[PDB]
Amino acid sequence: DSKKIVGVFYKANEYATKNPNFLGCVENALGIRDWLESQGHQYIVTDDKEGPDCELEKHIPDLHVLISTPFHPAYVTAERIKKAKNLKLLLTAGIGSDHIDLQAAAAAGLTVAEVTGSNVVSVAEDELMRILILMRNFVPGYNQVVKGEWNVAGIAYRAYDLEGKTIGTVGAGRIGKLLLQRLKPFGCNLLYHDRLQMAPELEKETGAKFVEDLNEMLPKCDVIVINMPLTEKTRGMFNKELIGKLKKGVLIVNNARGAIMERQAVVDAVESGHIGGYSGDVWDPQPAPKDHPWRYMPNQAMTPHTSGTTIDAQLRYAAGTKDMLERYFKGEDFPTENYIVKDGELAPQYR
Template structure:
């Protein structure tokens, strides 16, 4: 490529500089253009890699292990550039004039996270003539049109397992926050108030409550293991039953029929991936069948819930509390109704991006890139789309 640039430079100098600049100046310009060509040279194996992350701004310098942001860039810039690859990092991802859109036509690899997702539509895939690999630094690749990626022969992979502990711990925290009616008490303190009755009338113990997880994969299993010491009644629904020994160890009971499980639950935790089958799974009708006063925790994906139906049920009291960190779309617009509904404990998408999780998913991303450059396979569990086929959880 740089040879082409060099030839173009010679033509430019010959056609525009000749007769205008002295020979010494022409040679100086030519040397500068040749040097630029070498700087921009792309060896046969070099790739253009674009990473889309959130900006950390003043927080970037507060922790050297803060890798999941634009400034940290997963900590792989020096490694990539030392091998001759081009690495571009941005938070500007939406719309036809975004920074990401400018690079779509010639990038080879796109890295994104669930926390600041780059939505990869079928239209973008069509424009991406060089695209080969879509990597999710974290877990959850539903920001990608997976069928379009499969049809285009692309590989989609994520760092499976990288933040399951982080999310499971966060879910346990949210359950306790809702059950104990914690947030009103906190708000009283920062407002200088003191009204025990306003908190205690709807605060309960977790012990003895029935907790159901919709989805019992890695996160669902970890959550149930962490709930066992609280002496809850544990129920779960999934495509597959968990290992019988683990099921016995944690005392969990399987319910094949989701609509039979849900009315039994005091607390429902969503742990299923977003697929065409689970999109809008909790609509107005299904929510109406839940136990009145149910608590819901959702760190899976916002689009699993009907947004307005959740807001309405919180307003009516049918849902006594809703907590999670996933929204649709992300980042959530200021007018999103979940920001303003009563009895919620919502946060930005943070559960899976602790510093410990960032170190894990940064290392996993680097490992997959290294394997990609070498033409090696990834660990099987990381694949979401491979050779035109979607992983089982997305089928």
């Protein structure tokens, strides 16, 4: 049976023609249009997703599948679900489904799925990059170039080699483990904290040592890398008190969640110098407002939230979405780890 598939993405405009492999946008649309159309399906793609009169609302009443990404999410409210006569399947071309009312999706008998695990190398690489940027003091150097300056002393006094430094990851899930594997050849003192100790062999291969007590690990670190979920426990954990316990001049890398830090506590400790540098691509709020203080604080090496939307990540997102569409058309189960809701059943982790 012919299906109506709706994809919601932002417009990349000229960027989409400069790079036809930029799949996560309206213009290239996951690179699945030719295939969908060849199979007799309709593929409607739009960025116009907000308001009673938006293009998306024209299609909600009769679409079968709705696809979006956390970069320009089509919010799936109970109100919208109730209007959707044919809707069966919600796909995230990426990871993240916070824009979906999962309980309402479950109540309506829907399936909700995402491309599990497809960003992990991207984020790990990005963390390693930031460790080097902060340790080696790249940003002040770059800023001199642009300003016509040449002041070696002003860079060197806060520039170190990574070799020999103590690096701790707070969390050793998939991303943290990939990070530790990439840090191994740099000759560091690697520490990690997690609910779950890595296997002895993996500790040997990475040289990473398990520190059961997080409060024991933190003060030893030249660099701290945040690699845990945002929870009631981790929310604002990096406050004035905890930051004070860290090594004077500590460097912090955070591609996890912005709110794991107390926003102002970071600003204060960066201004005093207790934190020597802070780098990450996650913010609170996000997108970061024009006046977000982390933009303007000393020694920041921030970027917007893009580490998981490199072209290679996007290709994985598009491929996983195509695979799930094919399986949906053929009545085959998705990979178990991709399901958030399956035919009205919310996975236990999400309850």
